[PDB]
Scaffold this motif. Structure first.
Motif, mmCIF file in Angstrom:
data_model
loop_
_atom_site.group_PDB
_atom_site.id
_atom_site.type_symbol
_atom_site.label_atom_id
_atom_site.label_comp_id
_atom_site.label_asym_id
_atom_site.label_seq_id
_atom_site.Cartn_x
_atom_site.Cartn_y
_atom_site.Cartn_z
ATOM 1 N N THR A 112 -3.160 -2.477 7.127
ATOM 2 C CA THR A 112 -4.290 -2.244 6.242
ATOM 3 C C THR A 112 -3.803 -2.066 4.813
ATOM 4 O O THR A 112 -2.727 -1.512 4.575
ATOM 5 C CB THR A 112 -5.107 -1.012 6.674
ATOM 6 O OG1 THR A 112 -6.146 -0.762 5.721
ATOM 7 C CG2 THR A 112 -4.229 0.218 6.780
ATOM 8 N N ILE A 113 -4.596 -2.557 3.868
ATOM 9 C CA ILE A 113 -4.360 -2.340 2.447
ATOM 10 C C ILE A 113 -5.244 -1.186 2.008
ATOM 11 O O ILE A 113 -6.472 -1.252 2.130
ATOM 12 C CB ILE A 113 -4.651 -3.604 1.626
ATOM 13 C CG1 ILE A 113 -3.607 -4.678 1.922
ATOM 14 C CG2 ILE A 113 -4.676 -3.279 0.146
ATOM 15 C CD1 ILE A 113 -3.714 -5.881 1.033
ATOM 16 N N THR A 114 -4.628 -0.130 1.504
ATOM 17 C CA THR A 114 -5.333 1.067 1.083
ATOM 18 C C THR A 114 -5.244 1.205 -0.430
ATOM 19 O O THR A 114 -4.712 0.340 -1.128
ATOM 20 C CB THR A 114 -4.762 2.301 1.783
ATOM 21 O OG1 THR A 114 -3.404 2.495 1.374
ATOM 22 C CG2 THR A 114 -4.802 2.123 3.287
ATOM 23 N N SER A 115 -5.785 2.313 -0.939
ATOM 24 C CA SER A 115 -5.656 2.601 -2.361
ATOM 25 C C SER A 115 -4.213 2.907 -2.735
ATOM 26 O O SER A 115 -3.825 2.736 -3.894
ATOM 27 C CB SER A 115 -6.568 3.764 -2.747
ATOM 28 O OG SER A 115 -6.261 4.922 -1.995
ATOM 29 N N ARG A 116 -3.404 3.354 -1.772
ATOM 30 C CA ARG A 116 -1.985 3.563 -2.038
ATOM 31 C C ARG A 116 -1.264 2.243 -2.272
ATOM 32 O O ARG A 116 -0.436 2.136 -3.183
ATOM 33 C CB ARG A 116 -1.340 4.326 -0.884
ATOM 34 C CG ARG A 116 -1.200 5.815 -1.130
ATOM 35 C CD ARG A 116 -0.551 6.501 0.055
ATOM 36 N NE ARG A 116 0.635 5.785 0.508
ATOM 37 C CZ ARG A 116 1.853 5.967 0.018
ATOM 38 N NH1 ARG A 116 2.087 6.837 -0.950
ATOM 39 N NH2 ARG A 116 2.862 5.256 0.511
ATOM 40 N N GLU A 117 -1.561 1.228 -1.457
ATOM 41 C CA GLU A 117 -0.961 -0.086 -1.665
ATOM 42 C C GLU A 117 -1.373 -0.673 -3.007
ATOM 43 O O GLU A 117 -0.540 -1.229 -3.730
ATOM 44 C CB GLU A 117 -1.348 -1.032 -0.528
ATOM 45 C CG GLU A 117 -0.442 -0.970 0.686
ATOM 46 C CD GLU A 117 -0.626 0.294 1.498
ATOM 47 O OE1 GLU A 117 -1.687 0.938 1.373
ATOM 48 O OE2 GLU A 117 0.292 0.645 2.266
ATOM 49 N N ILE A 118 -2.654 -0.547 -3.361
ATOM 50 C CA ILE A 118 -3.128 -1.063 -4.642
ATOM 51 C C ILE A 118 -2.478 -0.309 -5.793
ATOM 52 O O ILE A 118 -2.092 -0.907 -6.801
ATOM 53 C CB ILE A 118 -4.664 -0.997 -4.714
ATOM 54 C CG1 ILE A 118 -5.287 -1.800 -3.573
ATOM 55 C CG2 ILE A 118 -5.158 -1.535 -6.039
ATOM 56 C CD1 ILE A 118 -4.982 -3.272 -3.628
ATOM 57 N N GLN A 119 -2.339 1.011 -5.660
ATOM 58 C CA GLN A 119 -1.713 1.808 -6.711
ATOM 59 C C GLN A 119 -0.251 1.429 -6.905
ATOM 60 O O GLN A 119 0.219 1.290 -8.042
ATOM 61 C CB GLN A 119 -1.843 3.291 -6.378
ATOM 62 C CG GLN A 119 -1.017 4.207 -7.253
ATOM 63 C CD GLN A 119 -1.237 5.665 -6.925
ATOM 64 O OE1 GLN A 119 -2.238 6.257 -7.322
ATOM 65 N NE2 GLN A 119 -0.303 6.253 -6.191
ATOM 66 N N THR A 120 0.485 1.260 -5.805
ATOM 67 C CA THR A 120 1.887 0.872 -5.911
ATOM 68 C C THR A 120 2.028 -0.532 -6.485
ATOM 69 O O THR A 120 2.910 -0.785 -7.313
ATOM 70 C CB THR A 120 2.562 0.976 -4.546
ATOM 71 O OG1 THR A 120 2.474 2.327 -4.083
ATOM 72 C CG2 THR A 120 4.020 0.588 -4.641
ATOM 73 N N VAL A 138 -0.067 -1.914 -8.556
ATOM 74 C CA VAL A 138 -0.414 -1.807 -9.969
ATOM 75 C C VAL A 138 0.766 -1.276 -10.769
ATOM 76 O O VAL A 138 1.123 -1.823 -11.818
ATOM 77 C CB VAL A 138 -1.661 -0.923 -10.144
ATOM 78 C CG1 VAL A 138 -1.754 -0.404 -11.562
ATOM 79 C CG2 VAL A 138 -2.902 -1.709 -9.798
ATOM 80 N N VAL A 183 -3.451 3.244 -13.294
ATOM 81 C CA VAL A 183 -3.375 4.166 -12.168
ATOM 82 C C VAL A 183 -4.367 5.304 -12.347
ATOM 83 O O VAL A 183 -5.054 5.700 -11.398
ATOM 84 C CB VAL A 183 -1.934 4.683 -11.999
ATOM 85 C CG1 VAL A 183 -1.905 5.923 -11.129
ATOM 86 C CG2 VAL A 183 -1.057 3.601 -11.394
ATOM 87 N N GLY A 221 -7.926 3.886 -11.687
ATOM 88 C CA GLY A 221 -8.148 3.646 -10.271
ATOM 89 C C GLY A 221 -8.277 4.929 -9.475
ATOM 90 O O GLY A 221 -9.132 5.039 -8.594
ATOM 91 N N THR A 222 -7.437 5.919 -9.783
ATOM 92 C CA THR A 222 -7.502 7.195 -9.083
ATOM 93 C C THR A 222 -8.823 7.902 -9.351
ATOM 94 O O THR A 222 -9.456 8.426 -8.426
ATOM 95 C CB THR A 222 -6.323 8.074 -9.500
ATOM 96 O OG1 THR A 222 -5.099 7.457 -9.085
ATOM 97 C CG2 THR A 222 -6.429 9.448 -8.868
ATOM 98 N N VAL A 277 -11.590 6.114 -7.438
ATOM 99 C CA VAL A 277 -11.560 6.403 -6.007
ATOM 100 C C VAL A 277 -12.081 7.810 -5.735
ATOM 101 O O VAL A 277 -12.855 8.030 -4.796
ATOM 102 C CB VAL A 277 -10.143 6.198 -5.447
ATOM 103 C CG1 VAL A 277 -10.032 6.769 -4.049
ATOM 104 C CG2 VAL A 277 -9.803 4.722 -5.427
ATOM 105 N N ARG A 289 -6.849 -5.655 7.756
ATOM 106 C CA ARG A 289 -7.767 -4.571 7.454
ATOM 107 C C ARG A 289 -7.681 -4.230 5.975
ATOM 108 O O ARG A 289 -6.619 -4.335 5.359
ATOM 109 C CB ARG A 289 -7.464 -3.332 8.300
ATOM 110 C CG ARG A 289 -7.677 -3.539 9.786
ATOM 111 C CD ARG A 289 -6.879 -2.548 10.603
ATOM 112 N NE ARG A 289 -7.277 -1.172 10.341
ATOM 113 C CZ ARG A 289 -8.245 -0.541 10.989
ATOM 114 N NH1 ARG A 289 -8.950 -1.143 11.932
ATOM 115 N NH2 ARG A 289 -8.513 0.724 10.682
ATOM 116 N N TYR A 343 -10.279 0.934 -6.106
ATOM 117 C CA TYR A 343 -9.104 1.010 -6.967
ATOM 118 C C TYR A 343 -8.856 -0.314 -7.678
ATOM 119 O O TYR A 343 -8.574 -0.340 -8.884
ATOM 120 C CB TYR A 343 -7.887 1.406 -6.134
ATOM 121 C CG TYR A 343 -6.806 2.132 -6.894
ATOM 122 C CD1 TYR A 343 -5.969 1.457 -7.767
ATOM 123 C CD2 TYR A 343 -6.609 3.490 -6.720
ATOM 124 C CE1 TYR A 343 -4.977 2.116 -8.455
ATOM 125 C CE2 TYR A 343 -5.620 4.157 -7.403
ATOM 126 C CZ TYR A 343 -4.808 3.466 -8.268
ATOM 127 O OH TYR A 343 -3.821 4.133 -8.948
#
Lengths: 80, 94, 98, 111, 98, 80, 110, 94
Positions: free
Chosen positions: B58-66, B68, B81, B84-85, B88, D34, D42
């Motif tokens: 899964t792609i989460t906000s952590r993946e998007i943040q990293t 970015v 960052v 986005g934070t 969210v 997923r 974000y």
DNA sequence: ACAGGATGTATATATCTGACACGTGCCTGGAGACTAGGGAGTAATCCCCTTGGCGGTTAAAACGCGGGGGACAGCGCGTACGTGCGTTTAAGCGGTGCTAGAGCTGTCTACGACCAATTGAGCGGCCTCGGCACCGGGATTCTCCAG
DNA sequence: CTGGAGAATCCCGGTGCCGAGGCCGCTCAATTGGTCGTAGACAGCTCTAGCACCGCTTAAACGCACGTACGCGCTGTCCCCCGCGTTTTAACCGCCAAGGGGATTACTCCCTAGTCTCCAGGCACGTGTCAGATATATACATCCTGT
């Protein structure tokens, strides 16, 4: 079509150099520039025609050109 | 017929938010559309690679943040960052 | 006595003109003919959208302008103000295009 | 049957860029099997912020050009004048954007 | 009189020696300390696999050797055999680091 | 852990230049090489540390370094 | 009663694993569907590239009077072959060194 | 312990069928494994983009062929296309 | 241009030695077989939109010429860098120990896919007005020769 | 070190025109709502390997001295490119026309996902043993001084 690289004239190459901030231009620069432009154009058009042939199309679209360009690391804005 | 799709209305809304009395031409709008698509693709691809490296499905906000903070440089990454934070956190509350 | 600007000042004036401007500096029809010739070398009886040839011209002009910037840097590095094919070759070699 | 009034996810996040559209694009782009709920939020926030930065700088470039409409030249000037934006878009060519006006010091008249 | 080689000959022989071999030319401990010092500002109490430091050293040495090849080309372009900081600057500027 | 850039000695930079086919080296080359090495290392290590932190680890692995290099178009073979 | 199992690599006349390539294609989420012939085509291409680079590296090892391919031989094979060099121009081979070349201007004067 | 994956045995088989009396070191085998992984990722990503561009959801042998002739240069591209086409034909034939 | 003196470097043999390549036992991940369903291939249509041609206008290219200023070869010099040597330093090797953290491993819960109904956001199309392109006229600035 | 003629450029003011933006209708895609399965977060145990230290050897770094050759500044000369005027040419714009093929839709079929079972291909581990560093001695191969 043949010998259309001569359509890239000496004044056109001079204008391109002026946009590059070139003040003085050697006489041999124009043929060299035609050669390097031909190489770059050959690469981009080869990739674009490959994209066109994959789509079973006979028309080279702007999407094919921009995909070819971003494949070479020459990503272009303004055409999709 | 068909029906296309673009970020033109959203880019225009952001422009009216940051410059209320400034317009934008169709060529510049297409350039902004290409920019948004390009940055979307870069961030999503880097996030996909992060998830694949970490054996996550899964792609989460952590993946998007990293992604970015990898792709964007310096203060651009820091402010992206932060935005986005905060988005969210505002979305989670609502 | 006719007026004559010293060599270089008109060159600087058109440097300023073509750096301020933004239009395509290559004639459209010769470039389109060149593109169609190269394409026919790749695939027979192809067709091009007008936007396809326009994108090709924008990309080629951007590439040539950047290459000439690097070439001018190479020429200035050699304590010269004239760009020479050696400068283009050095720029392409360092960029890795060779 | 008392369905609540629909609120778009961008409004919940306080964004102008479409969270639902970005979520669909993430799902359909084959990035992962997923996609989290906060990932489109974000990503839309980051895209909106970058768009806002570029548009602010380009509107500034249109201001001192005394134009009330952004053209590709303004975007190019804004991007190449900003070091971070130029670094982000170093490999990107902007159609009808031109180049930054700069002339090397050795080419200027020697006096 | 003691035997002496003329300037540039043992330099050429060690050019041949270091282009014939493959080992790392930077001492391992100083480079490892430099890597840990650079990494300490990004994150504290950070650790490194030995293979990670080895990969960093391999990449850095390859990058520096390529940069020195481009620098040598720049110095030869200016009709010199001595590489100078301006040559490194030109090479990095053309490559895209600046 | 300070001033470890001086650990990249003048003979080490000289050997690196010799592998680069450099016959003669100016005296100011060494500080410039230390600067460019510092910049390159900062970029690669920053990316590798970002990869490590995303994995919630606190040891920089070889794979993190390889991914950091591959992001910068400098992919390294021989470490995974 | 099941028939005797035949690996798709053997069915395609390949050494590289068609099954593993297919699984990696379906697991790297390149697309929601992967065709039957796509893994065998990709395995054939990968095996051909491996064969080319290993042929050149073994030739380099023979020219170096060694019967074992080391990273130096792979580097020589890649950099001497201009197409292989173009394919791998952005990669750095660990412990591969560089091609032995000195610019002719640096050679001794007389 | 764990269970790792590599192309080591396949690279070794190809080496033996191309150089029977020639070995390979561990570091060279790791480099070859990294090369195979990198080229696999390159070709698969290009085929993924090709499928996404044409609004297709399946990656077929023709997507891989187009990706190969987009990525490999010159004689490498045509030789690899020949090898892939031969393999696909003699796989569908059995 | 040729001795020869000296330093360096490919050859030529012993000689251990880890790393390689091969043999084993599992075990987990491909393979055989079968089913369902949707993606895509194919066919038909239609209507953009690409190509081709023609004619007039004129902007741009091609050509020629005079000359000046920049490229380049040559010369001088002085200083920075290569070479070599004696001295110092800390890298590298080989241990030793220890413990932080990478790496499974099992539970479970919260989160994301999926399905159905609904509606409003966004896109296609239309229309209009004002931002900017064009044109023409001073006002200004920079250039260059002549003092 | 300016004065003034000349040419380029910039500021300004008045048409005008076309495309940017706003409005409207539709429709399909995002929402909502509800459920279910499993991905991952989370605690816990293990045991790998990363870190730290110590001592000794010695390779390497370093500091110094000397000389040389190379970088760089200066000069001449010369010829190549730039500025400019004239002639040519084909680019560009507008218009027309035709048909190629992009692109949209409908139908069906076959190819791939998904399952279940099963087994063998490949991986972890262990183990001889042999290319291959690594010390010698040697036979030239160049480098450089001298004649």
């Amino acid at each position: 079509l043949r010998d259309n690289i001569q359509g890239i004239t000496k004044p056109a190459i001079r204008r391109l150099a002026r946009r590059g901030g070139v003040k003085r231009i050697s006489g041999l620069i124009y043929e060299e520039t035609r050669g390097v432009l031909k190489v770059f154009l050959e690469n981009v058009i080869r990739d674009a025609v490959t994209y066109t042939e994959h789509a079973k199309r006979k028309t080279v679209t702007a999407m094919d050109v921009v995909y070819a360009l971003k494949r070479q690391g020459r990503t272009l804005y303004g055409f999709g | 017929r068909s029906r296309k799709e673009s970020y033109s209305i959203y880019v225009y809304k952001v422009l009216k938010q940051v410059h209320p009395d400034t317009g934008i031409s169709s060529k510049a709008m297409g350039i902004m559309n290409s920019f948004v698509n390009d940055i979307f693709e870069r961030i999503a691809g880097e996030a996909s690679r992060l998830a694949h490296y970490n054996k996550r499905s899964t792609i989460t906000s952590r993946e998007i943040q990293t992604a970015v903070r990898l792709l964007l440089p310096g203060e651009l990454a820091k402010h992206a960052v932060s935005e986005g934070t905060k988005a969210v956190t505002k979305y989670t509350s609502a | 006595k006719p007026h004559r600007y010293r060599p270089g000042t008109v060159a600087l004036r058109e440097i300023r003109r073509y750096q301020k401007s933004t239009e395509l500096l290559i004639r459209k029809l010769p470039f389109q003919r060149l593109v169609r010739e190269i394409a026919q070398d790749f695939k027979t009886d192809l067709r091009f959208q007008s936007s396809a040839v326009m994108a090709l011209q924008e990309a080629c002009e951007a590439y040539l302008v950047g290459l000439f910037e690097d070439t001018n840097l190479c020429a200035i590095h050699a304590k010269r103000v004239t760009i020479m094919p050696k400068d283009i070759q050095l720029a392409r070699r360092i960029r890795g295009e060779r | 049957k008392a369905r609540a009034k629909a609120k778009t996810r961008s409004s919940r996040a306080g964004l102008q860029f479409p969270v639902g559209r970005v979520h669909r694009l993430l799902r359909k782009g084959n990035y992962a099997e997923r996609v989290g709920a906060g990932a489109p939020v974000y990503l839309a926030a980051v895209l909106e912020y970058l768009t806002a930065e570029i548009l602010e700088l380009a509107g500034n470039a249109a201001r001192d050009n005394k134009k009330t409409r952004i053209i590709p030249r303004h975007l190019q000037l804004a991007i190449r004048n900003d070091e971070e934006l130029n670094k982000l878009l170093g490999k990107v060519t902007i159609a009808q954007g031109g180049v930054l006006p700069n002339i090397q010091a050795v080419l200027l008249p020697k006096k």
